[PDB]
Design a protein around this ligand. Structure first.
Ligand code: SF4
Ligand code: SF4
Ligand code: FES
Lengths: 625, 625
């Protein structure tokens, strides 16, 4: 229908929205329509529930009433406090993700994690030496792991002056954070101090609350997310370039289709291993299946895509539609961005909805809790549930749409530097020469307010055309992939400068750099370039963008990009427009403080113009053409 | 007027409300009226702002729409997540409070905190030995302090299985927390994990979220609050019984009046020490003042009351009215419960409003930031500001309304056990004999929804009539004090059994046990009694009540009281009544799990009936009349 066509740009999504409509299944778009219009105070941020002297709303009335809360807080404080807690929720998701990776590596170091090993021992020694472990190159790998585990855990403590990975930032960027009071000291500490500041009668200055919001988000990018990325590479291998496929067509009628959903790869890496055991493959064969086919959703799909080339089934707004195919025999979920509607839609079919984390509980789900010491045993049990669910699949309701699209994935910073001969010198020369005018990381989510991936794909096309290389992470990866932009042949869709560089390296114009925690790879690349050139990150021709973000995590990623000197664009505004002072600080004031600011622009073509203008100005300050 | 009469039960509050009305000064009651009626969805908790697919509201509509959020969360999840963040904000207040006391003690142990010492070396050695410091009885005091600092910091890390002070709870209670997965592991970790669970698509089971809320609150009472209390006694002294006074009459017309506001006594102890320096006193008398007069507000006033006997000017809803007296020459604030309206009301007078913590910033306030390495220097500077403001006090607008009421304060557990001869046996004997039928800790705030202190005083009167001893902390202290119930002579207002025990020990029927962190003193006392009798805290004839609470911290205290087996009464409900399942869990379901539950009752007499009934049932299970 006209309505179905306006919800997404993808054929596989349209087909499933027709199927869901015919079957009477409501989707995220339907509930988004119901929640429209939204509460004007909640939209603007001028509402507060932090105590039961309230709840309060700030209104502009003729009689001057309701200008302040019961405690006396004005709109600036109330909007800033809400935005501060919004950021802290996002940093906390990445905080727990990074914490689980430390526990897993500690379990490996102690020999209490059957089925886990240190896949990349060379990276473990490099990271441990970088963070100061003594004799990281020669001591036994388990000892080196235990000492890195200790360094990581101490960043989750309250005794550090600065996070351990903060050393990667240029000295000028560290001096700036120090003068401003933004230096992140502890991953959990900043979140706790934010929750304390936003309590009634604590931090009642909107400038102070936003400064600590930056510090909280910086504890994510250079802490929770960076620890998660680096330890994931140690535990499961550093990504290298590889081919794979994307979209709902990666589901097979003839196979047990297991969709992994969530973020943490500690579970899905063992799910994948259980599917390869001979006895488990025998059960699938005894059930009439040709194979066991694992496919990814959202960031845990990105994780298996970067390290294993596991095909990605879809991104955020594709998750419900993947069950509508009738071929999803099991959804295995850990945490974050797993819509509870999946439980009800799975109940419409044979699909087993299996939760695996103590933090990711869903009423009505099948809970098989997974920890490092039992993951190999539990994941074997979970795949068996999927094989059993496969036997009850109704074939008359199976409709897997579309043909999978080829993609190239696995562009970690190690892979990037390897493709350049080992140093960033060829990369820097291309920028100086003007072949690659700059880099933009397009990151983030889908959002029902925006036609699915319309802004992600348009902005990607606009940027590579202007010789601006795109680094894609998160749910943008699937948008760039389904658009055919994640393959080296996509250089024909770039400008002459970017196309020529890409064709000499054999890489696509859009580099898939992983999941949402892997946005720390972009911080690492930016820090590595600024240090080499002897400048700040705010001098590099770079930018960040999330045209269709939804989550608190995307807010925290955008905030730590801005606080790190990266001009960051958002397609939709946060719930802050009720305060002009907070809005001006987010859009303009931060430029005077951290060298970068937020941009809110729903037109992806204007967004490309704005990101390009920042790049052009930074190129001028570097003395480039 | 009739309106002024309905806002408070006290004459000193009535006089300042009459004064503020003639001077055209809006108070917290005026703003509460503007915010009434409140938003229904915010009141019920059935609104969510956790992502920008929303904001969402859950409504009971005839057309069936808006039953779920955009992500699919129902009312049970949305209300439970809101309550979880509500609890986390309260636990974070106490967390940063305890973290600051660890920092002060560490600065003292390092010799980098002029003017601070270890005023109770005896308690330092006892506590450090209790938590496992080697040779704590004989090693140098600073060395023992450094080891206790390390132990305390580790509870602010992520490597422990249980907080250090949890060993105080009886084994049966620790085994229960373990089976339920409620054991608090890290003060900051539980807060960070709660913010992760409440992110979209993580924890979507209201039972699970509520269980982690109890864990998050238990990390407060047995962690942040208990560390804050014990380290404050080590740094500033263990409280002992002493006489003092309460209400706005503690302000002197002929003296420089410095009101200390907030929670942390690291500041106000050095403020008081600054007013006792001879050269500082000479400056006040050279300015025309008879002396410098320090008086307390809220919990930092409780701290100076417990350890120094400093008179208390008032509690929560008295803070604005204390400036309206015209005699408040300076307000010294740290953090929590400091209404931003105090800056505006101080601007109506000569009053200087001074902030001292980097976490408690107020636009327009005079910021003199205090840290252990410069507190002695800065606090002298703050008192000099107070003397200078005193020279500008307009005498025609001064109106100190009442005569202070005598109180007795300082009833730490150490003081209680000393009064009993060193063992709990005389107390246990009184309870077995029926002279003291039970204990109820009356804790918590004021709230404009309830006539100030009307429910606090009425419940306190009702409980001591029934031979139930009351333990008072927080802003209840000022209510019980102004009603004359904090002196030994108040035994005449108690039943025959409690009066006899009180006259025998020479103590009041209401024992002031300190600030809001000092509610950990109540947990310690219950744990000591349960351990001595070989039962659970849920077997003791005990109760908790906050008849006029408002803050997130009061909610957190109530949650860890219930989770520890103490039946807890709230005069007003949290924003949870939009979910019957969550309300039934808090009011009934928790009884089957932790042995206690919440009670919501705005009638203080019925609150006494419910509290007394729980105590009677527990006396029966112990085999008592
Ligand atoms: S903190 Fe202030 S603005 Fe927020 S609900 Fe409480 S009284 Fe209202
Ligand atoms: S988390 Fe769910 S209920 Fe809350 S605002 Fe987002 S979509 Fe709505
Ligand atoms: S729902 Fe209460 S203000 Fe938006």
């Amino acid at each position: 229908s006209k309505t179905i066509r306006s919800r997404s740009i993808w054929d596989d999504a349209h087909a499933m929205l027709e199927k869901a409509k015919a079957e009477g299944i409501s989707t995220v778009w339907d509930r988004a329509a119901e929640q429209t219009p939204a509460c004007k105070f909640c939209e603007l941020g001028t509402t507060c529930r932090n105590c039961i002297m309230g709840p309060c709303r700030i209104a502009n009335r003729k009689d001057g009433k309701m200008r302040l809360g019961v405690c006396g807080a004005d709109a600036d404080v109330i909007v800033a406090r809400n935005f501060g807690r919004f950021i802290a929720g996002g940093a906390a998701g990445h905080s727990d993700h990074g914490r689980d990776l430390i526990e897993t590596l500690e379990a490996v170091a102690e020999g209490k994690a059957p089925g886990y090993t240190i896949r990349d021992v060379a990276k473990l020694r490099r990271i441990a030496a970088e963070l100061g472990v003594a004799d990281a190159a020669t001591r036994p790998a388990h000892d080196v792991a235990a000492d890195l585990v200790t360094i990581c855990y101490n960043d989750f403590g309250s005794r550090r002056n600065a996070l351990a990975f903060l050393a990667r930032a240029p000295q000028v960027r560290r001096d700036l954070w120090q003068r401003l009071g933004m230096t992140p000291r502890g991953v959990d500490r900043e979140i706790a101090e934010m929750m304390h500041r936003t309590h009634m009668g604590c931090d009642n200055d909107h400038t102070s609350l936003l400064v600590h919001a930056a510090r909280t988000a910086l504890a994510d990018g250079w802490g929770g997310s960076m620890i998660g990325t680096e330890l994931s590479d140690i535990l499961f291998g550093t990504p290298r370039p590889r081919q794979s496929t994307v979209n709902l067509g990666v589901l097979r009628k003839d196979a047990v289709n297991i969709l992994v959903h969530g973020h943490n790869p500690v579970v899905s890496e063992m799910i994948l291993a259980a599917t390869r055991e001979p006895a488990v493959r025998q059960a699938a064969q005894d059930a009439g299946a040709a194979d066991i086919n694992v496919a990814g959703l959202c960031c845990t799909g990105n994780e298996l895509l970067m390290r294993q080339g596991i095909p990605m089934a879809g991104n955020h707004l594709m998750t419900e539609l993947a069950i509508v195919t009738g071929a999803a025999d099991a959804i295995v979920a850990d945490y974050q961005c797993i819509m509870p509607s999946l439980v009800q839609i799975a109940a419409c079919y044979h699909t087993r909805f299996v939760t695996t984390s103590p933090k990711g509980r869903f009423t009505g789900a099948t809970h098989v809790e997974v920890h490092p010491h039992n993951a190999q045993e539990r994941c074997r049990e979970i795949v068996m549930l999927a094989i059993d669910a496969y036997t009850r699949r109704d074939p008359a309701r199976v409709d897997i749409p579309s043909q999978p699209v080829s993609i190239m994935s696995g562009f970690s910073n190690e892979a990037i530097l390897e493709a350049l001969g080992g140093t960033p010198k060829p990369l820097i020369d291309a920028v100086v020469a003007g072949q690659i005018r700059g880099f933009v990381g397009i990151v983030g989510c889908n959002n029902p307010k925006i036609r699915q991936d319309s802004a992600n794909v348009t902005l990607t096309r606009e940027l590579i055309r202007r010789d601006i290389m795109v680094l894609a992470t998160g749910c943008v990866t699937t948008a760039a992939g389904k658009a055919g932009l994640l393959v080296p042949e996509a250089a024909s869709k770039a400008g002459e400068g970017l196309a020529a560089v890409c064709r000499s390296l054999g890489v696509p114009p859009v580099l898939h750099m992983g999941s949402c925690v892997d946005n720390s790879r972009i911080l690492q690349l930016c820090a590595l370039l600024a240090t080499t050139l002897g400048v700040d990150i705010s001098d590099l021709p770079v930018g960040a963008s999330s045209p269709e973000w939804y989550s608190e995590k995307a807010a925290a990623i955008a905030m730590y990009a801005v606080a790190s000197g990266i001009p960051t664009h958002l397609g939709l505004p946060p719930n802050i427009l009720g305060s002009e002072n907070v809005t001006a600080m987010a859009l303009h004031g931060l430029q005077d403080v951290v060298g970068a600011a937020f941009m809110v622009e729903p037109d992806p073509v204007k967004a490309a113009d704005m990101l390009e203008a920042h790049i052009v100005a930074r190129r001028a300050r570097l003395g480039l053409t």
